[PDB]
From a paper:
αD-conotoxins are 11 kDa homodimers that potently inhibit nicotinic acetylcholine receptors (nAChRs) through a non-competitive (allosteric) mechanism. VxXXA, VxXXB, and VxXXC from the venom of Conus vexillum were the first D superfamily α-conotoxins characterized. αD-conotoxins are 11 kDa symmetrical homodimer proteins comprising two C-terminal domains (CTDs or C) coupled through two interchain disulfide bonds formed between the N-terminal domains (NTDs). AChBPs are naturally occurring soluble protein homologues of the nAChR that show remarkable structural homology, especially around the orthosteric ligand recognition site formed by aromatic side chain residues found in nAChRs. In this study, we describe the allosteric binding mode of the granulin-like C-terminal (CTD) of VxXXB bound to Lymnea stagnalis acetylcholine binding protein (Ls-AChBP), a soluble homologue of the extracellular ligand-binding domain of nAChRs.
The crystal structure of Ls-AChBP in complex with VxXXB-C (21–50) was solved at 2.6 Å by molecular replacement and refined to an Rfree value of 0.29. The crystal structure of Ls-AChBP in complex with VxXXB-C(21–50) contains one pentamer in the asymmetric unit, with the electron density of VxXXB-C(21–50) detectable adjacent to four of the five orthosteric binding sites. However, only three binding interfaces generated clear ligand electron density, while the fourth binding interface showed reduced electron density. The F-loops of Ls-AChBP could not be constructed due to the lack of clear electron density, indicating a greater flexibility of these parts of the protein. VxXXB-C(21–50) binds to the C-loop of AChBP almost perpendicular to the long axis of the pentamers, making extensive interactions on the principal (+) face of Ls-AChBP. As observed from the co-crystal structure, VxXXB-C(21–50) anchors on the outer edge of C-loop Ls-AChBP via four hydrogen bonds between its β-strand backbone and β-strand of Ls-AChBP_C-loop and β4-loop inserting into the binding interface. In the four occupied orthosteric binding sites, loop-C of Ls-AChBP moves outward (10.23–10.90 Å based on the measurement between Cys187 Cα atom in the complex with HEPES/Ls-AChBP structure), which is a similar backbone orientation to previously characterized co-crystal structures of α-conotoxins 14–17. An outward displacement of Ls-AChBP_C-loop, which is characteristic of antagonist binding in the orthosteric site, is also displayed by VxXXB-C(21–50), suggesting allosteric antagonists can also inhibit nAChRs by stabilizing the open (extended) C-loop.
Residue numbers in the entry:
A (entry chain H), D (entry chain G), H (entry chain F): 1 to 30
B (entry chain D): 1 to 154, 160 to 204
C (entry chain B), F (entry chain A): 1 to 205
E (entry chain E): 1 to 155, 161 to 205
G (entry chain C): 1 to 158, 160 to 205
C-alpha cells in the first residue's frame, strides 16, 4: 500500500498526512 | 446521599482540566452525530452549514457512588467535569452550541454529553441536485490527545427537520487511526459521511 | 425581613446547579411561549427568526418566607437560583436573551422567569406568501432531566392569537396550538416531556 | 395498541421513536 | 474622602442586586432618549435601527456623602451599584451598548447612567418619504418591577448626527402602563415617539 | 525587581475602577488615531467602516518603580490597570478590538495602550468618488469625566497621515486633522473635552 | 508524578501574565502558518478570508518536571499559561479560534499551541485568475514586546504540505516565511516579525 | 548601504520605516 514520506502504512485504504512536528503519517481505516 | 451531596462529591473529585485516565489506559470516548438540519449549501464555495446532536460518552470511575437509597443519575454543568477536547478537523466556523451545557453522570461513573451544535464545513458538495446526491465528510477527534490518552470510537432521519430543503440518503460513521513517524502513539477520529440531496 | 435579607436567604438556600427536588417529587415547571415578532424569513435556507417571551414558572417551597410585614416578592439575578435547563430541541441558532436576566421569587416559593428570546427555527417559508400560511413548530423540554426530576406542562391561559404580537409586523398569526408529549422507553420507568408550540402565520396583504 | 419495536405504548395516538442508548420508545400525546 | 474611599464605601454599603426602595414608595426612575442616529429604516418590514443615549437617573440616598475634602461626584462601574432593569418592550434585537459601563454618582445620592445604545425596533414606519414623516414608538420600562416598586417618568434634538439620511421632526415622551395576561401587576414605561423622515 | 515583582506591585497599587488623580489635578490623557484601513463605505446607510490604531497615553505616578538593575518597562493586561473611559461620541457600532489587550507601563508610571480597533461611523459618503473626497469626523472624549478630572489632548506627532495606511485599500487618505474641543456650560466651572479627528479620504480611480 | 499532580503543579508556578524569561534571555517563540482553506477572495476590496493553523512554540523552564516514571507531556488550558501576544499587523477582523484552547506541555518545559484560526486580511489578491496567481502577505509579531523580551522566528520552514483542503476553489502555489528585524536610532532593542507570503490562484 | 533619516542600517537589504515615537528605523532581513 501507501508510502507517506518516510512512513510505510500499516494496512490498506490508508491516506497520507503531514503534521509540522510529528512528521509524515498514515490515516488508516479501523 | 441526596442530589446536593452527589454534586458536592462530583466537584471535589472531578478535575475539569485533568483527563481521567485510570492507570496507564486511555479514556474510551464514543461519539456519534445525529443530523437535525442542513441549512445552507454552496456548490461554488464547497461550504455547508449543518445542525447536529453530538452524542458523546465516556467513563470516569472516580465519580462513581453507591446508588441504593440514592439517585442513580444526576445532571452536572460541564464546567464541573472533564469533557474530551473534540474538534471537527475540517470545520471552517467555531461550533455554536445551542443547548444547555449539562452532562448526565450515572452512579457507575459513565458520562453522557449531547450538545446540539451548528457549524459550517468545507465539504465536497457536488451533485446535491442529483439522484445520487452529494456526500459531506466530517472528521471528529481529540485536538491534543493521542490514542494512549483518549480513544475515539463510534436510524438516520429520526430527528431530521421536515422543513429542510434536503433529505438524507445515508449517514456512515467509520473510525480512523493516524500514525506519524515521530511517535509510537496514534491519533483517532470518527469520519462521518453525510450523503444528502435536494428534494 | 428586608429585600437584602430575602436575597441572602435565597442565595444560601437555592443551589443554582442542583434541582430543588423536595423529597422524591419532581419540580413542576410550566412553560408558555408568547410570540412577539417574526423577523426575518429566508426562502433559500428555510429559516425563520422569531422573538418570543418564554413564560416559565416553578416552585421551590424552601425559598418561602413570611410576607405579612416584609416584601411579597423580589427580583433576583438568575445566577443566584436554579432555573430549569429548558431547550428548544429543534432550534438552529443559540437563544439570544434580550432582557435583564432576573427572575421573580414570590414569598410562597413560586419562581417566575420570563426572558425575551430571539431564536432561529426551521420553517416552510414558501407558504408564508400563501393564504394557508407557514407553520413554525417549537419543541421545548428539559435537555437533561426526565419526568421524575422535572415535569414540563403548558401553562393554562386566557388569551389570544395576540395582545403580545407586534401589530407593526409584516406577518399575522392565523393560529397557535400547544400540545404536550411524553416519551417513554422500555428500559426505564421515567418519561421525557416536552411542549410543542405550533405557530401558523403568513404575510399580510 | 401501537407497537414501537418490542414496546406496546401506554396510550392512544402515540408515535414511535428511537433513542441511541435507551432504545425504542413511544411519544404519546396530551 | 478621596475617590478610592468613596468607591470603597459604596462597595461596603451598596447591594447591587437589591432595589433601593425606601419606606414603601416606588423608586422614581427618570428616563429620556436622545437620538444620535437612525441607520436603517424598512417600510416593508417595519423595522428601524437606531442609535440613542438613554439618559437614566434615580436616587439612592445610601450612596450620598457629605464629608469635607471630597469630590462632588465620582464615576463607578455599574456592577458596583443597583441600576434599573430597563428594557424596550418592542425591541427585536439585543441592545448593543457602545460606551464604557460607568455610572456617575453625585454626592447627594443622585445616580446618572447614560449608555449609548444601538438597537432595532418593530415600529410604525409609514410615510418616512413624506413631509409629515413616520412616527416610531419605543416603550421602555422595568422588566421585573411593577408600578408600586419602580415608577418611570420622562425628565431640542441637539445630539442628532447631521450626516444621517433622516431628519428629526419631533420627539415626544409620555408615561404609560403595560399589562399582559401573564402578570397581575402593571409596569410603568416611557413611550418615546420619534417623528422622522428622509431628507429631500 | 524582576518582571513578576513589577506586575505584583502594579496590581496592588493600580485600582482599575478609580481614576488616578493625584492631589485633585486632572489625569492628562493624550490620544491620536493612526488609520490603517477604510473597508466599507455605504452610499445607502451613510456608514464608513474603519480600522485604526488608537495611540493612548497617560501617567499614573503611583505605578512607578526604580529601574536601575530592573526592567524599564513591562507589558500588563489592561484589566490590571485603570484605563481612561474614552469613547467615540458618534460611533454607531461597538469598537472591535483586534489586538492583545495589553498596555506598556514605563518605570516612571507612564502608560501606553495602542489597540487596533475596527469601528463604524456615520459619514457623508457622496463625495468619496470626487476629487475633493469625503470627510469622516470622529469625536473622542471621556464618557463620564469632565476637564477637572480628565484632560484630553491630541498627541503632537510627525509621522505621515497615511504612514501605516494599507496601500491595498480601495481608498486613499487626502488629509487627517486632529484638533481639541472644550464644551463648557453656565452650570459648571468645568468643561467636557474631546479630540475631533477629521479623515478626508476618497476612492482611487 | 501522575497527570493530576502535573496539572496541579503547572497551575501553581505558571504566571499567565508574566513572560517566562529565565535568566534575562528573551523567550524564543517560533511561529508558522499552515493554510487549511481560503474562503472568500475579493479582487475589488482586496480582502481575503482565510482558515489557518497557527503553529506556535516556546519554552517555559519553570513548568518542567522529571519524566522518568511519569507522563512526558500533558494538555493544559491556555488560561493556565503565558502565551505570546502575537498579532497580524494587517488583520481586519478579530481572529476566530475554532479549536479547543489547549496547549501541549512537554516535561522539559516546551509549549506547543496550534489553534485553528479564521481571519480576514487586507491583501494584494490581483492575479488570482492568472497562472502566476496572487500573493497575500501576513505580518506577525509581538504586539508589545521587543527582541530582548520575545524573539520571533519562523519554524524551520516548509508549501501546500498536505494541509490545504482540495475542496477549495483555490490552489496553493507556494507559502514562504521570512523574518524581519526593525531597529531605530533611539533604542538598542529590535522589533521582530515574520512575513508569511501565500501565493494562490483560482482553479480552472 | 541604506540610510534611514540620520540612521545607517546594520546590513544590506534593509528598508526604511518611521515610527511616531521611536523615529527613523531600519527594517532588516534575518
Amino acid at each position: 500500500t501507501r508510502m507517506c514520506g518516510s512512513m510505510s502504512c500499516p494496512r490498506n485504504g490508508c491516506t497520507c498526512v503531514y503534521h509540522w512536528r510529528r512528521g509524515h503519517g498514515c490515516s488508516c481505516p479501523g | 446521599l441526596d442530589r446536593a451531596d452527589i454534586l458536592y462529591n462530583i466537584r471535589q473529585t472531578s478535575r475539569p482540566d485533568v483527563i481521567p485516565t485510570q492507570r496507564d489506559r486511555p479514556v474510551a470516548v464514543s461519539v456519534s452525530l445525529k443530523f437535525i438540519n442542513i441549512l445552507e449549501v454552496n456548490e461554488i464555495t464547497n461550504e455547508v452549514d449543518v445542525v447536529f446532536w453530538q452524542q458523546t460518552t465516556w467513563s470516569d470511575r472516580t465519580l462513581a457512588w453507591n446508588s441504593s437509597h440514592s439517585p442513580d443519575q444526576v445532571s452536572v454543568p460541564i464546567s464541573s467535569l472533564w469533557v474530551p477536547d473534540l474538534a471537527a478537523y475540517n470545520a471552517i466556523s467555531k461550533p455554536e452550541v445551542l443547548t444547555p451545557q449539562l452532562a448526565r453522570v450515572v452512579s457507575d461513573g459513565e458520562v453522557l454529553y449531547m450538545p446540539s451544535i451548528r457549524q459550517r464545513f468545507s465539504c465536497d458538495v457536488s451533485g446535491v441536485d442529483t439522484e445520487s446526491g452529494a456526500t459531506c465528510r466530517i472528521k471528529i477527534g481529540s485536538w491534543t490527545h493521542h490514542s494512549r490518552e483518549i480513544s475515539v470510537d463510534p436510524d438516520d432521519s429520526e430527528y431530521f427537520s421536515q422543513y429542510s430543503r434536503f433529505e438524507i440518503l445515508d449517514v456512515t460513521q467509520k473510525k480512523n487511526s493516524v500514525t506519524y513517524s515521530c511517535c509510537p502513539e496514534a491519533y483517532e477520529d470518527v469520519e462521518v459521511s453525510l450523503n444528502f440531496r435536494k428534494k
